[model samples]
Target chain A: MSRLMPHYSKGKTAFLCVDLQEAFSKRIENFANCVFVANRLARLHEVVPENTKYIVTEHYPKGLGRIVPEITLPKTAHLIEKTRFSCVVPQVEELLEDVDNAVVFGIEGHACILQTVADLLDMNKRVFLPKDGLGSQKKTDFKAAIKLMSSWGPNCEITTSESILLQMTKDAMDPNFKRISKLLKEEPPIPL
Target chain B: MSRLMPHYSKGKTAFLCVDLQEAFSKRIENFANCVFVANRLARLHEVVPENTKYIVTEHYPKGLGRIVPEITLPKTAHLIEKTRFSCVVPQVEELLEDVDNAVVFGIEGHACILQTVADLLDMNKRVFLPKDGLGSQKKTDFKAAIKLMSSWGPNCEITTSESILLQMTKDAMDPNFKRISKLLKEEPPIPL
Candidate 1:
């Protein structure tokens, strides 16, 4: 397996959606595909249970408008805006005060995404990244960022959204299995 | 006793002369003071036994001229020039291989001097800086760099040129005593 299946107790983990503002998503020609991934991530609210916090980044919100409307984020979800490419902003650090695990995903894989992963790793946070959910303007840069993220220490992991959800569920009989399975099928990147 | 008395052991030690080029020295108003330090360092060639190699950096030789001609370097000195502010240039790395102890000196305490000391500390090399012999354009920057270098590890130290010379001589009976004493008297800022 390419990823470690850590036993994540509820409330100890958070999902960091980095720089998902409308300005960045709109710039990508593959906006529709990105939106599809974002929607599946939004469904994570239901599938992953309500205990885990969602931390979203809006990179310099004064320049970039709010996160796209189609994504359903909880009202209580923490939001941080940063000027630094890395989400190592003090606001992010404050939000991560009690959390130990982070699953990071979002736009422009070369700059912000790469920097965020590197900072999280330096801070010794347990990080997991969804391979298909994040991308860059250039395909080569995106691939290179993914390669670098995957090479981090044992606590860091890279896996597909479905694979992670499936691994977390473990068996078909698990309580959230059916709901997660339905969401995975609805946004499957591959034909079954 | 904040500074360690530096011992000059041949293969075990070296002199790291960081960015002593005309371009950088001339830019800093303390140019005259730094040149004075450079001259003091030149006398170190005679005091520091024949076996010690001088690792010199000429920052961007294409832009900055060679190490100032007035500073009489030994014919065996190993020279490395860098465009990067750090001595991270390939030639610097090659010169650093297997070296454990170094007496560091030179110009621009904030840039090249600071970076070179930080790298040497990271590599677990024992570093000694001649406090009076290193010069920076701004006293504040030089002081800050010295503070950082001292905090790196227990193996790093800052000493005066006379103190290092005393450590090298060991005692009045040492054969090089009269020669080193005479040089110390002749050298400005270190008059016996």
Candidate 2:
């Protein structure tokens, strides 16, 4: 069932880009790598089955700044503005009402990203976390956050960018396969 | 309730050390670090509430050799030898009948450790995986296995050694706290 192996059908999945703001680029470890993965994750909006929701959550935008320009969200992606660490605000909840699986990625693994994932899992949504797509100012804090989050599973998954891509595509025959394969081969924005 | 927050009670939990045989020391990435964590994990038996079960699995003893000398299981620990990739064989299942949560860590993560964790989760046992306690010949394979395992959550958690220790102790006042804290500060057998 949905509790064990998630369908990963684009129809039921939402890709959550959490707090990838300009302020974090200089503060978070592996910022370039996280942004690189985010760039590729956002690109999936063009290839996956239609209706897959893409949401970007910015924490306290007034001072935190916008999602870095290096990453480009699709025209259809929802740009949610929020002050809370978790992205499960009313507007985000509305967009995610029908979502069964969430692919969450972004900065400060111990803060906004971690809280957002916890809220998403609490809502009973399956969450896929790509380690390379997440960052924190301190490596120890980032690692601790990841470990704590891992214990929260059967509902959440810790994985890699390539694995998430292939899991979603599922088959080489799928139209998205070639593009995904290409993305998988390209060098990461910065050495991971 | 058990799915989201696993109770790390000694009576209900079993610590599974999977395939940490001597043959893997030269082959697996971070083998020394994995052994170091395993050593600390085994030491927990001396300090945790009594009756906590420790099970050591050997994939194929005749050829792979014994569990590394660094790890010292308590007198009550069960050594279950098996050829199967998963440790959920008859003997292990029997030992684990009363258990609800499993702390699984050890060698060749993509193979034996990965299969063992999958089987454990399938059996409805809450699994806690400490990344530092796991090893694989290839880092990519280990990371991939960890990611695949992550998707199977609310029953399984991927975490760290220190985090697992604290979760089990729960409070600074617990009698085992100082011993665990000292273990936490000791340098790894080799740099991680």
Candidate 3:
């Protein structure tokens, strides 16, 4: 059945990490969970293939400051800055010009993340999102965003970080996959 | 730094062409652009990589007739027949589990597409939308959907079929690149 399975492929995929900069991530009141998810998403770079691009978005950087250091960014990652709530800022479009597939994750599900997803979908690019990776200062907004995305299409599905990493691992023999598994299995030291 | 360029790889993405089904598309009083965009999207299959998935959604298929046949759906395409305007029917959720990203297009921008986009973003998936591909029986509703989606995130940007196809092409040398270029050059085959 068409509704029974939404399609997903890894080829030429890019990972979009939205507004996780120090300025934005700090604004959320109970940022513990948000930080946790951000950390997990940062680790995705290790598991996903090298060909896949990583793009990061920063909203009003002058006012917001750079993304927090805890979230690791790769050397090849592309960065875009925007003032609008939607990531449709001109630079975003230019960078996205050649990329058709994307996986988006980040903070404030109701605001920046919400707008970006809508814009991307409007542009006819394929998008994937994970519920566990996004949140807002208010739970209501987060909840509303979730409902809206899921109801729009079969493609707008929610997922977890662990699940995505596991899917990226084509076989146990893959070195990056093994490293990611180790990272998943162990608990990291807490920064005081 | 994380708010600028959102990323996802090619072919790993899928497009959820929502509610372009006969029931809604046929009844909408002023959907000339919607029809054009939907048809353009149908032709997108030829250019997007075979690995990229396309999902067609119908709001109440029994009442709507199978999504208008003119809209070509690939062999791997999934069909989600829905009762709710949101297409968040239980079956829809099951299908989303596998997809990592999506782009949503098609009818009644405010009622169906608007609501669905919001819900999907909340779920934390990457979403792209095309303003031209959506419509409502009333222009007011269509505009409202645009306003709502725009306000939600900077990630949401409006685009045309040609722009979307251009993004899918990794390089000018891509074998399918010329097909999209040809598509872009042709006018809609409707009798004036």
Off by over 4 Å in 2: A1-7, A49-51, B1-141, B147-192
Candidate 3 per-residue lDDT over residues B1-192, each given as its tens digit: 012123324325567778776666567754555666666766676455444567777877776466776666767677877777785567766667665555678877888887787777666666666554666888777676776776665445444444455445533445665676677665543311
- Model 3 alpha-carbon drift over 4 Å, by segment: A1-192, B1-11, B29-32, B189-192
- TM-score (C-alpha) between model 3 and the true structure: 0.46
Stretches of candidate 1 exceeding 4 Å from the true structure: A1-3, A7-11, A188-192, B1-192
Better of 2 and 3 by DockQ: 2
The sequence of per-residue lDDT tens digits that candidate 1 reaches over residues A1-192 is 234545334446677887777776655545555556666766766456444677788876875578887677866678777665567788888777887778788786656676677677677678877765776654434553454455454777888677766666677987777787788768443332
* Each model's backbone clash number: 0, 11, 70
lDDT of 2 at A33: 82
Tens-place lDDT digits, model 1, residues B1-192: 122333345355677777777776566765554555556556665566454567777877876478887677767678776678877577867666867677787787777878877877787777766665677878798778776765564567565554455545444445666676676555453221
Per-model TM-score of chain B: 0.83, 0.91, 0.80
Q: List pairs with backbone clashes in candidate 1.
A: none
- Candidate rank order under lDDT: 2, 1, 3
Model 1: DockQ score: 0.02
The TM-score-based order of candidates, best leading, equals: 2, 1, 3
The 10-residue segment of model 2 chain B with minimum total lDDT is: B1-10
